[PDB]
Short mmCIF file of N, CA and C and ligand atoms in Angstrom, two decimals:
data_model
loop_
_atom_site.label_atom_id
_atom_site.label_comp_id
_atom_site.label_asym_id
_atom_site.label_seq_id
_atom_site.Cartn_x
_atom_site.Cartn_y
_atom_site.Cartn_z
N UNK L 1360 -5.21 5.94 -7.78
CA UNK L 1360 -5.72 5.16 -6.60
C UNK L 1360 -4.60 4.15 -6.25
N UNK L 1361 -4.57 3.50 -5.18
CA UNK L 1361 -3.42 2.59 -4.74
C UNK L 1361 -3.30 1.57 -5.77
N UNK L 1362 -4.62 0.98 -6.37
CA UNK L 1362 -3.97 -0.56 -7.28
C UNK L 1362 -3.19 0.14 -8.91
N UNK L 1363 -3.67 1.51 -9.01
CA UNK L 1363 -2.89 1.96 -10.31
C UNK L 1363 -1.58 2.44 -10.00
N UNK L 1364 -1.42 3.05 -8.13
CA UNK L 1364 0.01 3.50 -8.33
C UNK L 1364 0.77 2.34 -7.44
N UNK L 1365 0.37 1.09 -7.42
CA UNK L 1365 1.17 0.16 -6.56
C UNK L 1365 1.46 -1.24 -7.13
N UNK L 1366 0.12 -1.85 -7.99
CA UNK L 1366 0.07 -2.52 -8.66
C UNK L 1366 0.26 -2.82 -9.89
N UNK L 1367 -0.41 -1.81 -10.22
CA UNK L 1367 -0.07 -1.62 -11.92
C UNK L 1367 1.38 -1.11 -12.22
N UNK L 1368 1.56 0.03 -11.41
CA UNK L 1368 2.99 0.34 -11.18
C UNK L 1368 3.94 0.35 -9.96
N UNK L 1369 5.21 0.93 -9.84
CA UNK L 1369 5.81 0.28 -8.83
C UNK L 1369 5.27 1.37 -7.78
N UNK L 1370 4.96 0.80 -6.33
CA UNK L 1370 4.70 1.30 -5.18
C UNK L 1370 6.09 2.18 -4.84
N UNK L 1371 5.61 3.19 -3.51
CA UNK L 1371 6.60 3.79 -2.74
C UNK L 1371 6.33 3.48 -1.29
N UNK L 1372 7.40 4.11 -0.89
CA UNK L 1372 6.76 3.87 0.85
C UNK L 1372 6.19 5.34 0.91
N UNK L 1373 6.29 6.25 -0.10
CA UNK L 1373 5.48 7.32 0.30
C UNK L 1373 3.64 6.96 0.07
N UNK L 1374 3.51 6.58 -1.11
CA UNK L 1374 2.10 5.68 -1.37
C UNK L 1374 1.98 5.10 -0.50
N UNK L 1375 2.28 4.38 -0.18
CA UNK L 1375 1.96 3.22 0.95
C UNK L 1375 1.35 4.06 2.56
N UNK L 1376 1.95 4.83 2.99
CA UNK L 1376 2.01 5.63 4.08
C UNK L 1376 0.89 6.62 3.81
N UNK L 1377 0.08 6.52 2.17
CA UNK L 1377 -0.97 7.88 2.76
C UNK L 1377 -2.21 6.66 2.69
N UNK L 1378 -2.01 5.69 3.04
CA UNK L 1378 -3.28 4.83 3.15
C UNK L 1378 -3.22 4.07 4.40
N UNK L 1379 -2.22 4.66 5.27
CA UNK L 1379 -2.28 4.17 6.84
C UNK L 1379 -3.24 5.62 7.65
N UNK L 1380 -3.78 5.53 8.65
CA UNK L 1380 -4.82 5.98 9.23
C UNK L 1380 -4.26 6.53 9.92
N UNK V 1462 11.49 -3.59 0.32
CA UNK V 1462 10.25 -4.41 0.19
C UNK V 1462 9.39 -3.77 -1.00
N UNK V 1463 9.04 -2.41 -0.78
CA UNK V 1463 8.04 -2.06 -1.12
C UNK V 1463 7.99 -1.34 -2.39
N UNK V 1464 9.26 -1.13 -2.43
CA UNK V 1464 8.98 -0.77 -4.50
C UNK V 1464 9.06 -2.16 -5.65
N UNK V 1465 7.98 -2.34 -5.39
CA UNK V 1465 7.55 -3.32 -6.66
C UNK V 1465 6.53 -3.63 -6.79
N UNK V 1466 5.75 -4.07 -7.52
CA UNK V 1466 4.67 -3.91 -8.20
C UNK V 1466 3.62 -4.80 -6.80
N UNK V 1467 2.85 -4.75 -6.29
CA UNK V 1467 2.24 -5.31 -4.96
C UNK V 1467 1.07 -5.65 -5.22
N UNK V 1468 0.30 -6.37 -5.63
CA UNK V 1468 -1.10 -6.69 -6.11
C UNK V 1468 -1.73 -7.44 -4.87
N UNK V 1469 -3.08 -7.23 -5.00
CA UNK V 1469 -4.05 -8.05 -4.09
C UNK V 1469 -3.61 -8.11 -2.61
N UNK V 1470 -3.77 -9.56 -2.29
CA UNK V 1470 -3.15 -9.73 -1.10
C UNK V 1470 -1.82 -9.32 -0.38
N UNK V 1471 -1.09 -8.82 -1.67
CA UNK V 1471 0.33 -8.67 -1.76
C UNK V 1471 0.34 -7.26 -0.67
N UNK V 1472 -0.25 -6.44 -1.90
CA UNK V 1472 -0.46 -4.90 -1.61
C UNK V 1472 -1.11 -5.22 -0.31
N UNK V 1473 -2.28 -5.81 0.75
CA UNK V 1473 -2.76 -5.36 1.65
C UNK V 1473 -1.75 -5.56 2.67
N UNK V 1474 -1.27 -6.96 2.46
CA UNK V 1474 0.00 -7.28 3.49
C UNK V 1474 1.19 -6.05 3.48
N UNK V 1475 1.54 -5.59 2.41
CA UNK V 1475 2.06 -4.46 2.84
C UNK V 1475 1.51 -3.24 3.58
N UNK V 1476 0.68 -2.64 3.36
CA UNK V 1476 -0.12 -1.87 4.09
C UNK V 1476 -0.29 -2.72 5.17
N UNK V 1477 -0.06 -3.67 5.50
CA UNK V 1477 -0.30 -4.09 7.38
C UNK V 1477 0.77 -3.94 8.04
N UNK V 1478 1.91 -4.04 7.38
CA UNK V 1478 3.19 -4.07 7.95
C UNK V 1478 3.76 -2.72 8.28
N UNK V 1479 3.84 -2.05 6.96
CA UNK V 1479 4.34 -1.02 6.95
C UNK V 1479 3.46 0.18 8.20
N UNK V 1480 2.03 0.28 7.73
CA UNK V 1480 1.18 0.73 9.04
C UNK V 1480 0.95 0.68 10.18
N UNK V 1481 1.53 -0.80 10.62
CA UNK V 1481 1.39 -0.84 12.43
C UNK V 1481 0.00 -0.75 12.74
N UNK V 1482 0.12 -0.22 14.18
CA UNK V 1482 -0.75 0.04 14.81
C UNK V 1482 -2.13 1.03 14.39
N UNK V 1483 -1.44 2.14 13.55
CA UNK V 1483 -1.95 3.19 12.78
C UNK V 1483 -3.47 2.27 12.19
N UNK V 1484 -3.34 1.68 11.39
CA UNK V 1484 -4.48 0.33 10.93
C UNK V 1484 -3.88 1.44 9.32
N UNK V 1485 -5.14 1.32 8.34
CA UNK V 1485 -4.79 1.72 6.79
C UNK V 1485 -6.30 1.49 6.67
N UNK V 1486 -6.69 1.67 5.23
CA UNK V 1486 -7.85 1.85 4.42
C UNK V 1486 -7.50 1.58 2.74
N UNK V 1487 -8.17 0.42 2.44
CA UNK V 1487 -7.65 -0.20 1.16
C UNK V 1487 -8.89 -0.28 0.37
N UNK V 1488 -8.80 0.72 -0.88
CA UNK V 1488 -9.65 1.19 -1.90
C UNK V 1488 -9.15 0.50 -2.87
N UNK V 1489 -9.62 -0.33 -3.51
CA UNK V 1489 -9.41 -0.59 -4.77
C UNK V 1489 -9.99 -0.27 -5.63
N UNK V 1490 -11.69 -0.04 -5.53
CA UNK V 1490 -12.68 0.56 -6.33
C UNK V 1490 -11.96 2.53 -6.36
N UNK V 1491 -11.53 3.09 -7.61
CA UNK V 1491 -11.60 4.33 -7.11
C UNK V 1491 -10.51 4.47 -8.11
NA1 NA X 82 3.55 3.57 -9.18
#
């Protein structure tokens, strides 16, 4: 989920981009 | 910006920026 692959670990701009609409 | 660890408010402000206009959807439960 985003807070385990962003927070807990380091984010991407690919992560980041599948939680824009 | 965005490879590093982004918590809370951190993480949503990124998802506002990076998203634009698009808007985003922020799950933390999950
Ligand atoms: Na990660």
């Amino acid at each position: 989920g985003i807070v385990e692959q962003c927070c807990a670990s380091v984010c991407s701009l690919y992560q980041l981009e599948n939680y824009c609409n | 910006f965005v490879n590093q660890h982004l918590c809370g408010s951190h993480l949503v402000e990124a998802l506002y920026l990076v998203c634009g206009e698009r808007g985003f959807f922020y799950t933390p439960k999950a």
